[model samples]
Target: MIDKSAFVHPTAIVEEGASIGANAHIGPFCIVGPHVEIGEGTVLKSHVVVNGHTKIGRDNEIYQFASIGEVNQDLKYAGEPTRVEIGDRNRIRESVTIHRGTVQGGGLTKVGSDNLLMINAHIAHDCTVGNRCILANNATLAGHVSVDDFAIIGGMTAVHQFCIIGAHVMVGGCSGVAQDVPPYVIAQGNHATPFGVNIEGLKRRGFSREAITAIRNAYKLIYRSGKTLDEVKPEIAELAETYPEVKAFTDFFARSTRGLIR
Candidate 1:
């Protein structure tokens, strides 16, 4: 009913059916659509357009000129009331675009808490981004991509459709990611190739020396051992038993649809 303790700038336009939570600040020139629900303590800082059937959670700070919950960029979308679901405490930066889902791709595009969608980043239809991930400036995800927790897609990178970015993985800037990136790995280049374990990132995340070493070896088993995936999987599984953090490797391989970066 357009009634709240929150501050809505006079120039902001929130449609009749939209629900603005307590303490939300809809800044000047923001346009919130009828079916959108903005949760408590969220701030849309000027010139933001949030449309479609979207649900944005608490304490998110979407910066100026960002577009959230727009229609899918894919042409195959026939306009089926699809949705964008965002969790709490995300920082959606200037000029970023987060589009809605397509029915074929599960009918919902979702982003978890604590993510940073940097300037000019584009998240396409039906994507799932896990918590604490970073989409650096100009990074783009094609339709149906899934990014796991703590992964970083570097600046100007483009991930192919349906690819999976595993937990703790980092792709270098200006890369083209055409396949799945496994957990704890670093990948780079025009056609991205696996380089090494993200040991530096692991250390920052507080991974133990033993777990880091085990992950490095697991990377070697995949890329350097010249052994087939079937051959090295058992070894990784063995490591998983001792160091629980290493289990993400086995789990990633189990569900990987696109082949791993060679």
Candidate 2:
């Protein structure tokens, strides 16, 4: 049922089985389908459609015409039931579409807390978005993309399927990424080459001068140095033993299944 203070228009269709939290304003011409849950203090602006097993958390402000939990774009989708889970304190802008998961992609699209998804952004099936991330306008993720915490993808960027975008990485606007993005750097271009270290970002985030230097050195060794990735691991381990911050960077590199961007 809708809140008394909320002015849900007569034309709006809220299914009986849906859960609407306190002080949540559902505007005119909206649809809250069955199995959909909206948390406390959230507001869904006009013409929004939240459907198909979606669960939205607290204090979210969804703008006009946005659709959450539509079916996945996966080719293997056979109408099997799946879910889309959005965490708290998110600002989903107008025309954004976050699709639900597909059974072939493990049945869940997980979005972490405190994100700002700009207008016209599209999150495809089964994407895992971490906390404090920002997906700028027109950013599109192919199915199964994983973005780590504090990552920022610039407007008009497109990420390929199964790609891993590392923490604190900055993707330039209008870039295209098909490979894994390394942490603490900036990437941009038609093929998305390493632009530079995310120095300004790390500085603003309180990374020490020494730590930034260490990460820069590590990037140089990984990409600029001619050593093969296999040979680089032990060398990186040696550097890690010398610098604790370098050790942390090396750990992320070691765990890169698709390898890091360069």
Candidate 3:
């Protein structure tokens, strides 16, 4: 049911089972599928197509021609009822394509709050994007990737399937990311490599001088100490005890599936 306060443009097509929330605006030429649920105050700009079993959250601004919750490109996808669930306050830009998940990959693609999915970006099946992320123009995330909070995936970058990008990391433009990226680092290369601590980003995020110092030391221990991961992990764990901020680094390495970027 379309809420009484919601506005659906005359040229738009919102299917019968679709739920349009209070004060939401479905703009001209947009097509919302029957199984979709649009949340309160969300705005679907002209020419957008939201399909499949998608649930979009409140206050999102979906720009012209963006396609959300489309069928997955995965060959194994055989029309299972997989879904795309987007959280509040996302800016999904023009021509971006966000596909639903595949049953083999847990059946859900999740995007958290306050993200900017820039023009022409593509988020494939089963990817999980955390809060406050920036997927810049043309950046593509392959299936089953996990991008943690505050990560910036630069323009034209391609993240490989099953990779994990840790919190507060910055991946440079046009890079190919095939392995896991640890937290609080800057990665830039054809095949991404850890540059250093993301000092500028940390400062912008209001990280204290003491916390930044600890992170810097931790970075050196992992990347510059000339020690193996097994050798340096104990040192990183020790630093985490003193500076809680360093725990993000330790936590990422603990669960890293694809080995860290060399």
Candidate 4:
């Protein structure tokens, strides 16, 4: 049972066997379905539909009409009951849609801690989102996409299915991402080529100049040197040994699952 002050409207349906934690507010016209877990100190602002088998963690704020844990949008779904797991301190802005996972892809759509999903963003079925990430307004990810920690996808960007966005990468607004984005790079423009090292972002996040320089060189090897991937491995390795930041960027390019953007 939810606390009386939390204010669930008379017409709103809170199904039996649902768990609403202390001080968790379910606002007017919102619905909490069976087996759904709403954690402590969370707020579901008006008209939110939190259904299916979803578990939401503490101190999260969901805005109006945000639909969570809906059925997967995949043909492979096949009516199998999958889950949506959202972590703590996240803000899900107005009209965002977060779909549940499908059995074909690990059976869960996972969102990590402290994420900010801006208005109208769509996280599709079976996407794995890492901690402290920001999906700006109207950013969309297709099914099975992987967004690494601290990545920022700017407003209006769309990532294709099965793409990997590495940690600390910044994607520009209105870009289309069809391939992997290596860590610590800024991807911009229509075709979304790697613009440069994310030097300003790295500095704001406390990265050292030497570390930034090393990463820049690695970026040069991959996007500027005109060398084949195999040809760039050794140079990247030497820079990787020089700085931790460089290593992260180098390792991402070396081990990219989907090939890097042209």
Candidate 5:
């Protein structure tokens, strides 16, 4: 059912069975497929196409030319009803493409709240993007990649399949990310090597001085101390216990399957 308060432009197509929430605005040339759900106060600013089984939450501003909930590029796709779930208050800019999930890669592609996805960004099938993140222009996440909350992926970056970008991590522009990046680290270069702890970001996020110190110490142990991850786990774990704020770093180490950027 389409709410009376919602506005759909004459040129926009809202297929039957699509649910348009109160005050939602579908601009000219936009298409909303059947089974798609747009939440209250959301806006599609012209030329946007939302299809498949997608659910976009309230107050999202999706710019022109975005293609949301489209079929994935996976060759194994057989028209299964995979989904794309987007959370509240996101700013999805022009030309962004967010694909639905594939059966081979779980059946859902999710984007969390308060995120900013700039022009030409692509979120591939089965990828999970967390809240308060920024994917700059032309950033691409391959299938199944996971981006944690507050991470910032620079322009034109390409993240490989299944890689995890930990919370508060900042990846520099045009880098090729082939492995996991631990929490609070700054990574750059073709194959993304760790530059240092994200001290400035941490400060901006209100991390305490003690917490920042702990994260810095943990970073040195993991990247500069000539010790393998196996060798540094216990030490980092101890630091995590000592400084509760550094727990994110240890938690990421425990779950990192693709290993960390060197």
Candidate 6:
């Protein structure tokens, strides 16, 4: 059922039981299948297909030919009716494919608000992308990957399955990320090596001089201290009380499962 204020193109097909919200625009040749809930002010450009049990949030803009909330590529899936959940104000560009979840890999694939998913980007099953992240063109996130807030996955990058990309990190283009990258660093390569602190990014985000200095100190402790990671852990942990940002840096060790990029 379509809302009175919503505009469905004459050629578009919104199947029975689908809910279209106020002022939503379903463009030409699009298909909105049953069980989909599209929110207010959302625009689905021409040739898009929205299926599965998808719940899309308000004020989002989807470009042409995006195949969202379809079944996953996982061969083990047996039509369990898993879902895709997208948050508000995201700019989803051309040909982006976001697959629904799998029972084994959790029940939902989710993308948070204010993100940019560029052309040909793929979000495989059960992946969780946080707010304000940018996935450049052809960025492919494998099944169950978790990308945290403010992180940037570069173009043509291949993120291996089950990897966690931490908040505020910047990964270079055309790289392969097989390991978990900790927060606030710049990493890139076939195996993805850590370069240093993302100073420019921190500056642009309005970090204070003391905060930046503390972050720089923490990076040195992790990379250039000439001491083992175990030896420097206590000192970095001590800095957390005074510099909360450094606390997040030290806390990254807690969730880095694939091991932090050296």
State which candidate, 2 or 5, has the greater lDDT. Answer: 5
Worst 10 residues of 2 by lDDT: 1-10
Candidate 6 local lDDT, 1-262, one digit each (tens): 7799999999999999999999999999999989999999999989999999999999999999999999999999988999999999999999999999999998799999999999999999999999999999999999999999899999999999989998889999799999888888999998899999888988999899899899989988888998987898889999988998888866677877787777
**Model 5, span 1-262: residue lDDT tens:** 9999999999999999999999999999999999999999999999999999999999999999999999989999989999999999999999999999998899999999999999999999999999999999999999999999999999999999999999999999899999999999999999999999889999999999999999899889887899887898888888778899788877887778898888
- Runs in model 1 with CA error above 4 Å? 1-3
Q: Higher TM-score: candidate 3 or 4?
A: 3
Clashing pairs in 6: none
Clashing pairs in 2: none
The residue pairs that clash in candidate 5, if any, are none
Off by over 4 Å in 4: 1-7
Clashing pairs in 1: none
Tens digits of per-residue lDDT for model 2 on 7-88? 4567788998888887777888899998889888888888999999989898999999899999877778878889999999
Off by over 4 Å in 2: 1-9, 238-251
* Model 6: lDDT to the true structure: 0.93
Comparing 2 with 3 on TM-score, the higher-scoring candidate is: 3
Model 3 clashing residue pairs (backbone): none
**Model 5, 255: alpha-carbon shift in Å?**
2.0
Which ranges of candidate 5 are over 4 A from the true structure? none
Evaluate residue 86 in candidate 6 and report its C-alpha lDDT on the 0 to 100 scale. Answer: 99
Candidate 1: minimum summed lDDT over ten consecutive residues — where? 1-10
